[PDB]
Each structure stands twice: as structure tokens, then as C-alpha cells.
């Protein structure tokens with residue numbers, strides 16, 4: 398009786414395990430399978446899918462005890478998709494040393510510690526009461542638990558499988574349950590009619606990989622999909638000529654960027670990294686490819702950071718003359734530098750690259766495109782420049798400056814960035830510091846080092862564009878996810 402929803406996607410995540418699936422492609426599936434203790438109510442008070450309001454979800458209520466602990470009273474009678482009841486034991490397990498942040502845990506959940514605050518072990522007080530806490534003060538615990546770090550996993554089932562196998566056969570409490578997957582092809586979910594919240598409106602949801610955006614557009618037109626993802630503003634004219642189809646877009650809390658393998662000699666030092674940054678004329682790219690709908694941040698700095706947004710910070714400059722001076726200072730010898738991109742996995746990746754190649758040529762640098770196919774993982778040692786994105790996943794400036802670029806984390810450890818000591822000291826400091834003038838100035842000091850060092854170059858916040866049949870009522874949200882709770886009606 399309920400319609401089956403068909404979504405043509407840019408790709409599938411490497412896992413459906415909540416943390417290992419953090420990516421542009423995972424939340425749209427993981428949000429359906431799981432619930433967290435707290436949900437972001439994107440559409441509260443008439444907001445156009447960008448409200449930050451956090452409301453109770455698997456937690457019926459909660460109260461902060463002190464600067465490092467929160468007591469959660471859980472909703473009773475919630476079931477996981479395998480029939481097991483959700484209790485404090487599952488919530489404690491979700492945020493335990495064993496699963497998330499301990500030495501052994503991070504062998505199978507590699508960013509469990511990197512992305513977490515300084516957790517202490519959860520304390521189970523009764524079947525429906527758990528205290529979540531940090532070893533040191535943290536004013537962000539609530540925000541973490543309402544984020545993509547927050548999905549609650551089933552303790553016994555997850556332990557029986559381990560994180561890798563669980564990521565191929567996930568069980569949660571959410572409105573849709575996992576049915577099947579074929580790697581790099583599709584994921585099918587089915588309605589969980591035993592859902593504790595509003596009943597699911599779709600009988601099944603299928604996420605089908607269609608890597609090429611032109612093919613994905615053609616598939617919505619030809620009636621193969623109900624919704625398609627990862628389009629650009631210029632794709633609106635291909636869709637909108639048809640009366641029964643439309644585009645739906647919004648600025649999302651994500652940053653497109655490019656970054657460097659700083660283990661490679663040409664990028665061991667900051668000079669050429671910063672020259673490449675200064676040579677990009679972002680306004681021109683945004684005009685040409687984005688209809689002026691993408692937003693160029695004034696540093697690693699967004700309005701949804703709230704108290705750590707600095708509206709007075711100056712934008713990063715486009716300065717060709719200075720880029721040229723830094724190319725000469727760097728001793729650049731004319732070697733062609735590759736830029737790897739997995740096609741248009743990121744919207745406008747290839748057109749933006751081709752515009753940037755011309756800007757880099759104007760600075761005296763030869764950059765060559767290396768477009769690779771889905772499922773052809775380039776070796777780290779073969780990467781010079783690559784594109785990437787970072788979801789700005791708390792309403793706080795700590796992410797992703799600290800969570801990606803901080804001490805011991807991926808950019809420094811895997812990709813070789815030799816950050817100044819003071820950068821790493823500031824990263825550690827801001828995690829214990831309450832919002833206020835001092836925290837805002839510390840983030841500006843981090844941003845200054847980040848700009849000087851250029852371990853990555855921020856391009857813009859994309860204007861995310863989906864296309865859909867008008868007979869499917871669904872609004873996008875300002876994040877790299879799809880929300881169907883209270884937001885998916887057919888006809």
C-alpha cells in the first residue's frame with residue numbers, strides 16, 4: 398500500500414556502522430536505521446530546514462549534573478530491529494571505551510577517539526538511566542550526542558559481529574530497517590512498523606549508486622528515481638522544464654576543500670601550499686558554476702558555529718601576485734602536480750578543478766587532473782593534491798578544525814602535516830573552555846595558523862541540490878543528510 402522510495406545517489410558509504418559511515422553518503426541511510434538520544438529538529442518554528450534546536454529522542458529527558466556529566470532518562474519500551482529492548486546498557490556501550498574510544502576500539506572504529514570529546518566510561522544507574530561524562534570539563538556533550546557521533550547501537554548484537562561486520566548488517570531503533578546491500582551498487586531499507594516514533598511512510602527505501610550526475614538526472618526524468626542527490630544549480634534547467642519534477646536545494650553545513658599529502662616533499666613545507674591557495678579566485682568559480690548560491694567562508698568560520706562564528710573576520714584573499722612570489726620562494730621547479738578527484742562525487746568537482754588548473758597555470762604552476770573511478774582507491778603515496786569535504790557537524794567551531802586537523806588526528810598523522818606546537822596547544826585548550834571572548838579569540842588564533850600553514854584550502858560551502866518528483870513531498874535540510882521524520886509524504 399505505501400509507495401517504495403527510490404533515491405539515485407552519488408555513492409554509498411564504506412560502512413553503515415554510525416561512525417565508520419561518516420561521509421557525504423552515509424547519514425542519508427544511517428539516519429533511517431538509527432536514532433540518537435537527542436535529535437536536531439531542523440524544521441522547528443517554521444525554519445527552512447536549518448534550525449539547530451535539539452530535542453529529546455531516545456532520551457525522554459536529561460539534565461546536566463555538572464561541567465562533565467549529564468544524566469539521561471531513557472524512553473521505555475523502544476526496540477531494536479532484532480527485537481532486543483533498548484536499555485542504558487546499549488547507551489553505555491555506544492559511548493564506552495570498548496566500542497568507541499579505547500585503544501582496541503579504534504582499530505575497527507578508526508575515528509572513534511579523534512572525533513569524540515574526552516569521554517570517561519558511562520555509568521549505568523538503572524535500566525533506563527545512564528550518565529554520560531567526560532574526564533575533563535566539556536560544555537559540548539549535548540551537541541555531541543545530537544550529532545552523527547550519537548546513533549545508539551545494540552550492545553549484544555554489535556559485540557557478536559564486531560564493527561566491520563555490523564557495518565554490513567546494521568541493527569538500530571530507527572524508522573527503517575536494513576534489508577540488503579550490494580557494495581558500490583545499492584542499499585535497500587524496509588519500513589520498521591514497530592517504530593517508537595511517527596510511523597514510516599515508505600514501504601522500502603532504495604539508495605542506488607549512479608555515479609555520473611548526467612545519468613542520475615536522466616534517471617529521474619526517465620522515471621527510475623523519485624529523488625536524486627548531489628546536483629548543481631545549473632542542473633535545475635535540465636529538470637525544471639518538466640512540470641512534474643523540480644529541484645530542491647539549500648546551503649548545507651559542509652565545506653568543499655582541497656588538501657595535500659604533506660608526506661610528499663613538494664608539500665612538506667607551507668610555502669607552495671599557501672601559493673596554491675592564494676591563486677584561487679573563488680568568487681569567479683562561484684559565479685561561473687554555482688549561480689552565486691555557494692557561500693565562501695570568511696576563514697574556517699561559519700554562522701552555525703554560533704558563539705564561535707566571527708562575522709568580522711576578513712575573507713581569504715585571491716592574490717595572484719603574491720601567489721607568484723611564493724611559487725618563486727618555494728623553489729618550485731615546474732614539476733606537474735596531480736589533483737585526484739573521484740569524478741563528481743562532490744558536486745562541481747571536475748568543473749571547479751578545471752577552473753582552478755587555469756588559475757594555477759597563471760601562477761606558474763602545472764597541475765594535472767587525475768580523475769579516478771568509484772572503487773579504485775588510490776594509494777596514499779600516489780596522492781599530491783586531492784579534493785575533500787568536511788561536514789561542520791556541531792553548532793560549534795571545534796569541528797572540523799580540531800576534529801580533522803588537531804593533534805594526533807588524520808591530517809597530522811596520516812597526511813603528514815607538521816603543525817606548529819601552538820596550534821596543537823590551542824586545539825587542546827578550546828575543548829575545555831566555555832564560550833566567550835577567550836574562546837572566540839582562541840579560534841581566531843587557530844584560523845590564523847591554519848591560513849598560514851594551508852594544510853587544506855577551503856573552497857566554499859556548497860548549495861546542495863536534489864531533484865525530485867513533485868508527488869514526493871520532502872524538504873532538504875542544511876546538512877549532508879536526508880530527514881524523513883515528519884518530512885516524507887506521497888501524492
Ligand SMILES: CC(C)[C@H](O)[C@@H](O)C(=O)NP(=O)(O)O[C@@H]1C[C@H](O)[C@H](n2cnc3c(NP(=O)(O)O[C@@H]4[C@@H](O)[C@H](O)[C@@H](CO)O[C@H]4O)ncnc32)O1
Pocket residue numbers: 411419420421422651739742774785786787788789790797801877
Ligand atoms: C575501509 C578501508 C579498509 C578501505 O581500504 C577503503 O575504504 C579506504 O581506503 N578507506 P580510507 O580511510 O583510506 O579512505 C580513502 C582514502 C581517501 O582519503 C578517501 N576518502 C576519505 N574520505 C572520503 C570522502 N569523505 P566525504 O567528503 O564524503 O566525508 C567527509 C568525511 O571524510 C569527514 O570526516 C567529515 C567531517 O569532516 O565530513 C565529511 O563530509 N569522500 C570520498 N573519499 C574519501 O578514501
